[PDB]
Amino acid sequence: DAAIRGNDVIFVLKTIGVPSACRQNEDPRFVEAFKCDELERYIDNNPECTLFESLRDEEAYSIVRIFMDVDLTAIQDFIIEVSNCVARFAFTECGAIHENVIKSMRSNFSLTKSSFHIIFLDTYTTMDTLIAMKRTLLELSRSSENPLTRSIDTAVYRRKTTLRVVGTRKNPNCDTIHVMQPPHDNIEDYLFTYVDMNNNSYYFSLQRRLEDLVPDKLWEPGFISFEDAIKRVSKIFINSIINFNDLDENNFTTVPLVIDYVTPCALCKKRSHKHPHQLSLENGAIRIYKTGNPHSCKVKIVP
Amino acid sequence: FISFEDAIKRVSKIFINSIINFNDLDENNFTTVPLVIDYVTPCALCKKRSHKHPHQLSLENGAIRIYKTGNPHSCKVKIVP
Amino acid sequence: DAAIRGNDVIFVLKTIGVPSACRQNEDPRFVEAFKCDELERYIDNNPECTLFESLRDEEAYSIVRIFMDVDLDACLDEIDYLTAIQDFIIEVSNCVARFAFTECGAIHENVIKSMRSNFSLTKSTNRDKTSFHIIFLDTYTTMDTLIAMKRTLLELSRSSENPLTRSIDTAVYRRKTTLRVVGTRKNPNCDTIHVMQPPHDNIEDYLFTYVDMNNNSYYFSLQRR
């Protein structure tokens, strides 16, 4: 909870792929620190420019706003879905309040037409939260088939990030600019390094003092296996299985299952398959194959 | 073929983690410079944890093949069409 | 038709880039013709030889088996290799049967059953590459049919995504084509050779110019011409 110290200075880079030599040395041709009033004057002075946004020092200050880049009812449902998805994490471990999050994210946003950028005015968090759930956003985009969710880019969440300033072209050769969308007019409504406190917003982070050590163990979360998938595995084998009595996701792969044969084999046409069978998981796909000589049987995949 | 930006976007989508050498990639030397992945999370190809070697890309039959320098059995081969 | 005509003589070139003039006169030091046992013995006495398999006269007898070559510069594990080979077999059979039903006038089920019935595979001694020649034993067609099928095979290789399917070389379907005999050196000073597989132990099953039609084989050819 920094609270007291307010971030109004904007850190701008003037070259994509800037050499690392004259970047931390405060080169006037690559790095500048401007404010609200000077930015439009600089834009007026230089008709052609390429300006990207960044942070002063990620180690010291890493407080940003939640933003998305996509490349009326559709966006109306998209905003609600995104708010619910992030509120799930906010209530998961953040120690925050879901009601505060949904109140903060409600009807307070901006739009930009070039592929559009969304920044939430009254939502402040720390960049490690953004780096934590790029995978969650990707999973949400993949699982759902919503119009605007299908093209969400999670590659923008990284360290030393860059966000193109509205009205600044990628290159002088290109003729594509960001057209500002009403009712927002001032540049301060499109600055993801801008921080304020208006006795209505909310701040959330991991809040349990982790140094990006959240992943403790990802035990292949296909533990719906209670009777859905494991019964499918027992369905492909017509003959009875004896080790089926007690199974768990912990011993899901390590145990060599031994079955009994009274009718000829299911996967192939052989006799009793003396070497025990075995199971593996890859890319969320269940794989079944025979130990010893795998060429004496057939590998079967179950989604 | 497709634009180089689209292919790079697909490659960066395949790799969940970020690339710290993204700016060095170009349309003429995208098969020689090794790629280093910031290993905060396991790579999507093979889980393991925090590989200690860079990756590389090859162009064949209109597809991009991702292969890891060193022992080939460590990381699974991936093809982007 | 062919009826009695069943090829059993193996025509072989002993040197890549054979002179054109020498071939027309059957030069002994570049051109030979054996049987199966004669070829096996000739390879046995001389393990340093370099032999290629090709036809002699394409205007009189042009009946060959279906053959494919796969070469990928990436090692694979056992289970992934097995899954890839199964998918490759299924997709190749589907594509070939579709072409046979569309442009040749054959029957889809017979072609696909004949192709999945018997097939032979090889392997390379290289520890970093996956290369193999696959020959379908019970399917027969003319060379021009394969030349026509080249476009469909190229389209299938471009469209697919399996590591083995993307490595199909369609350049082998050319006039006056040659194929390397298994167990025989490619370069005079290279130790990389091909090896057989446990299901098949005879060389007769590894040559695409050997024709012997039993009751389980299928034959088809182009009908538009």
Ligand SMILES: Nc1ncnc2c1ncn2[C@@H]1O[C@H](COP(=O)(O)OP(=O)(O)OP(=O)(O)O)[C@@H](O)[C@H]1O
């Ligand atoms: N480390 C990285 N830094 C920046 N972009 C990266 C990185 N890794 C992968 N990428 C991808 O490369 C793409 C190239 O960025 P670029 O600025 O050209 O995109 P754009 O579609 O024009 O975006 P915008 O809508 O923000 O103007 C990014 O959109 C992103 O998907």
Ligand SMILES: [Zn+2]
């Ligand atoms: Zn890996």
